[PDB]
């Protein structure tokens, strides 16, 4: 029913990894990590690789600590407009 996460998410040792099949997909969805209030985390030290179309989000600065691991909140949507309610929100858990 609801949209499925457009990329591939992988919990790594020290970071969250989001992979896409092309740069077109990654720039189309433009994933960002947000806090409990839904604002993008500007102290997040993520890395972007457009050779392999991968986004890496370190747990410490980009995710929220909970019992057993981290919760990551991801927002995707169109970057060509200021219409924000068509964006999609996703929440994942990565065990420590």
């Amino acid at each position, epitope marked *: 029913e609801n949209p499925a996460f457009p990329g591939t998410l992988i919990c790594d040792k020290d970071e969250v990894r989001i992979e896409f099949s092309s740069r077109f997909d990654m720039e189309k969805w433009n994933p960002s990590v947000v806090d409990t209030l839904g604002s993008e985390i500007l102290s997040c030290t993520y890395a972007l690789d457009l050779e392999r179309f991968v986004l890496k989000f370190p747990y410490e600065t980009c995710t929220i600590k909970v019992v057993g691991g981290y919760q990551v909140n991801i927002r995707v949507g169109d970057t060509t407009t200021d219409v*924000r309610y068509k964006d999609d929100m996703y929440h994942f858990f990565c065990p420590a």
Partner: antibody
Amino acid sequence: QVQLQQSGAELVKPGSSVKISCKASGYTFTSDDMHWIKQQPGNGLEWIGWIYPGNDDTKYNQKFNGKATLTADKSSSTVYMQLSSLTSEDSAVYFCARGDLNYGGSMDAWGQGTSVTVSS
Amino acid sequence: TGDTVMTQSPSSLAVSAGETLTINCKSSQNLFSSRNQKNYLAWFQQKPGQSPTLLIHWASTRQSGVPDRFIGSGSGTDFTLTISSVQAEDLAIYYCQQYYNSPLTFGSGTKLEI
């Protein structure tokens, strides 16, 4: 110049269905969203869902899943909302509103409202 | 679950003529977009027997033809609508709305009676 003309009020028994039409004029029909809003008598406003007549993309409030169905006819520049299995909670005034995608989808233009009354 | 809750206060207001009232609306989620550096919040006025009317959008910007006595203000979580020198035609119910997220949500509303 922008006008939204909804169909007239309707009175039905519980369990029946109604289809509310909203005809848009004064702007490019497929370039904006159409929002539907429910106002119960003596109560506030509740957001049902939006439809984009361009590609017929839709988004619903999960509370209204299965209750409301949005469709759009580009030739007539008219958006339809179908309400089914009507109960007493479904008696309300229903507004269509244009989400202006230039300004973030904010709803500047509203229809006059359609009163749906469910009684047995 | 996941819905952005709009908490509007007070529920009702009773005032006279010429004084200035303030309506507060707080959101459970930030409505600020770093892209356009704006907060997604609208203020609506609905008189009895009429469709709602958009007063403020972007939480600070008045619609064309709206008197300057309506002042939208506030920050990502906290928003305020101030109506200076209230007039008889300002008698209505006022709603705050967030359009940053789907589902779009309203405040419970503020009844004004003079």
